[PDB]
Design a protein around this ligand. Sequence first.
Ligand SMILES: [Mg+2]
Ligand SMILES: [Mg+2]
Ligand SMILES: [Mg+2]
Ligand SMILES: [Mg+2]
Ligand SMILES: [Mg+2]
Ligand SMILES: [Mg+2]
Ligand SMILES: [Mg+2]
Ligand SMILES: [Mg+2]
Ligand SMILES: [Mg+2]
Ligand SMILES: [Mg+2]
Ligand SMILES: [Mg+2]
Ligand SMILES: [Mg+2]
Ligand SMILES: [Mg+2]
Ligand SMILES: [Mg+2]
Ligand SMILES: [Mg+2]
Ligand SMILES: [Mg+2]
Ligand SMILES: [Mg+2]
Lengths: 205, 82, 122, 80, 156, 129
Amino acid sequence: ARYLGPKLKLSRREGTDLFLKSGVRAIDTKCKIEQAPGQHGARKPRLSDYGVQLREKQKVRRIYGVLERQFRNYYKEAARLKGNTGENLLALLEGRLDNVVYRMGFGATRAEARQLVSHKAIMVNGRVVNIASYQVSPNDVVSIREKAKKQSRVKAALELAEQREKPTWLEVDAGKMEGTFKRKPERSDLSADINEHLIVELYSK
Amino acid sequence: MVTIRLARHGAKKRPFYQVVVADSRNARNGRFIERVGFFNPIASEKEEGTRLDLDRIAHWVGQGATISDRVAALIKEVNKAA
Amino acid sequence: ATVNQLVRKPRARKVAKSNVPALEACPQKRGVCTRVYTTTPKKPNSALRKVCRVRLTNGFEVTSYIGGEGHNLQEHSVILIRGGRVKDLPGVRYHTVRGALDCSGVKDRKQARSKYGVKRPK
Amino acid sequence: KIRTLQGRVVSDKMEKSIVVAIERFVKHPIYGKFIKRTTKLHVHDENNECGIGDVVEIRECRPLSKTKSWTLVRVVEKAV
Amino acid sequence: ELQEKLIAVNRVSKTVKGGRIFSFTALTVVGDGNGRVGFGYGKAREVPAAIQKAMEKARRNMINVALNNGTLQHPVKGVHTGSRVFMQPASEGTGIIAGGAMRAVLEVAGVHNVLAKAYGSTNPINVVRATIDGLENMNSPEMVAAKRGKSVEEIL
Amino acid sequence: SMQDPIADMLTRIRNGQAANKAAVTMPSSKLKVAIANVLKEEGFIEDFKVEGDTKPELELTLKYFQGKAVVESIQRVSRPGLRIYKRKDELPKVMAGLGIAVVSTSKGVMTDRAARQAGLGGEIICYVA
RNA sequence: UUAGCUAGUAGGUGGGGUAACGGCUCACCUAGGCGACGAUCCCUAGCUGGUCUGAGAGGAUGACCAGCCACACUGGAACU
RNA sequence: UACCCGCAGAAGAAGCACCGGCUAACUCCGUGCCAGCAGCCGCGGUAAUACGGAGGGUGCAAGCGUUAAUCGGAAUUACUGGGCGUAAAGCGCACGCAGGCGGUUUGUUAAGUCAGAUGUGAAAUCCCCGGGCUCAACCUGGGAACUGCAUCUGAUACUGG
Ligand SMILES: [Mg+2]
Ligand SMILES: [Mg+2]
Ligand SMILES: [Mg+2]
Ligand SMILES: [Mg+2]
Ligand SMILES: [Mg+2]
Ligand SMILES: [Mg+2]
Ligand SMILES: [Mg+2]
Ligand SMILES: [Mg+2]
Ligand SMILES: [Mg+2]
Ligand SMILES: [Mg+2]
Ligand SMILES: [Mg+2]
Ligand SMILES: [Mg+2]
Ligand SMILES: [Mg+2]
Ligand SMILES: [Mg+2]
Ligand SMILES: [Mg+2]
Ligand SMILES: [Mg+2]
Ligand SMILES: [Mg+2]
């Protein structure tokens, strides 16, 4: 129920970095991410109107580590909710337990955060949750459990989460290994290289 | 005759009764005259577990609607609580 | 044209019959082969297609088209028939599905093995 | 007060009975056209003070025969 | 500045005494992306020349549209020779709900949210003219108030 | 045969606007005067004046703003072959508010905004935009 | 490309019958009743809240559940 | 039993469809209008990105494709929302019954229409706000809705008497 394969072919296909690596190694040195994978990546194919929308949705899906069915359910929920459909979909995508714990900095990558969530290491509001799709509400308390506070990979992720960008909607503290979800992130708060309209145009069919 | 009884509408291993007034010659969860509150044996704390309508229960018992065993054992609990 | 005419004559539909009458709105039907042979397509392209006139259980007798290369089926063979016609063959409206009760699958098949009923190689 | 229906009479060649016609003005559920629909009924017109064409007023009381459950009240429009 | 975009390329032919000589046609839509839009239909012996021929005419034959902040003012319909277009103002987040040669020209023009529908023959050459006439004929509240003689709040 | 005076009036004013007529004279009626009052109260026409003792005539004067006609489309909605009646909450909205839909109601012949403010429906007559 | 159907049939008087009104039934009298707003006849079909699809209007449909009707090898009948 | 806790080992756990355009994905090998593919356009006559295999790529995922039915696209039965000179569409023409519509003013009625109220429109289902199942599916409380009908009290511009 999740991708089990190369973590850089998808990034090469999309054309940009998908943040699937921790960041210790440079993205250019890690792989030849300039062209699409396979034996025909040298050519530059002209992408169609459906092609660009499909590529954008696949990029978003691979970045957030979800499947097609879960993405469709999230799109349905975003359309059901009030306000901007794309912004609501983005907020719901960046509201999962693995995503929020990765943003806090307890996991190196999305896969590492999802594994930590699954293996019963993440606790929300003093409660054990092993669901990778567990939505978090404003004013919650995510925390590393006492047994898992002594993990070398966890503390490595904690020390490696600082040199990169810092979200302005989370309240994190590595001393006690816990954070708080202050408020729902905004579109300007999130990344600005994602075309929201492409996903809704693709799903309007 | 008219009887105040329950009707299961929850799921497997998670019962939830809808206390209703129904004719005796009817199914357990079939046709009922009116709905009077509900009951949940697995209701968690800090949440309602019984919301019986004592006014309607008294109105029906004044017309002769018999009260079944569990609803009779729950109306006394409701009266004791408030 | 006008509401006064339309109330007298309601706008009738344009219902069209299905292209698979012998199925009687059924995905699959079991039949017994009666005449297995080879035919030739029409003018645009020349070839030698493999066809079989089969009597269905309900009573209809139709002409199917064997897919792939290699078919051990013959007369008095129980086969399963699904919808879908062949464009370049007049008369055929159904396809014999391989991997059926007696229709053996295509030998040494590696791609699209499910469409021809081939076990996954080790 | 009492629900009464006013309609034109059709036939009166029956003993203590007449045939009334009611013209209800309804709108077409599909095209929105306003058409008229007949509501022919049999009325137990005791002491038949009615001819052909004159409008009458009837009320439902009870089933009096196999095919009538309406009785006359007053006759308006009697002049021809 | 501009957001020039090619819609589609078509290959035409013309028989002559010696034989048949081919030719290419290009349809392009240009605009500043805020309130202006223009279309260009060029023809040349080759694809690279035809696209530039269409682009130049589209640039020099633009039309200014008095659109809303992100959408169009009021729902409108445009009628052309073979294509009919219907455009309705949507809400924020819907996107350019269009198809064929309408979504591209709508995105180039500047609108971001609109529901578009094509009735009749859905050819790009006619549908582009239909969808630009639909935006040309529509007016703004200030524009309609100017001819009315009242204020926007009065004619709200 | 003349079977819709309101449609005749709408056709006359539309043709006058199309042909750049200063004013359009025609036989008048009470409903025509009521509709002309609404049309003048919204700036769609310049003015009007009933002239005549036995056969009154309306003399509606068109308005031209920067050459182009002020009124874009006047469409007869409820024609005498299909009557259309709408409630207070089901009234139409021409050009999302930029146009009007004349409605004859119990209080008279008012517009969409007036009918909605008063809280009652009526039957529509025509859309003016 | 189903146009005339209906003689207990329409109505009336009286009797009988049902827990109840009623040609429900009987004797008599009137010749009426339905029908191009589709009578009569043929094929098909349990109905509804609902379900799928559709922006909407609409189209299809009656899986589960719930409300109603009919049936219990076929047909006829009556008793408690 | 749900659930919690200790054992050890990354083990016991991924396949299907497609790759000429519609539609996201290209290169060789084997044949040579034969073998074969196909929903359409159509391919194979020795350079097949269309047949079979391989390499590579794309989509979905404990599911993947085919088949059968329904709705959409089909504005292709168009009341919303078409046309009739030439593509299909004005009876050869005229009269006329039922029917459809109907110039202009006043008074009256208020049937349609418009306003308000009452009863009903079962529960269930959809939607909105919350809660419980570790999330979700699922259950549940309230609200809205059930676009309808009947009655009462008024409004009189329009249609109707
Ligand atoms: Mg799954
Ligand atoms: Mg939304
Ligand atoms: Mg008697
Ligand atoms: Mg549709
Ligand atoms: Mg049933
Ligand atoms: Mg293909
Ligand atoms: Mg349709
Ligand atoms: Mg047409
Ligand atoms: Mg012709
Ligand atoms: Mg001809
Ligand atoms: Mg002629
Ligand atoms: Mg003739
Ligand atoms: Mg009235
Ligand atoms: Mg009302
Ligand atoms: Mg919850
Ligand atoms: Mg309900
Ligand atoms: Mg009048």
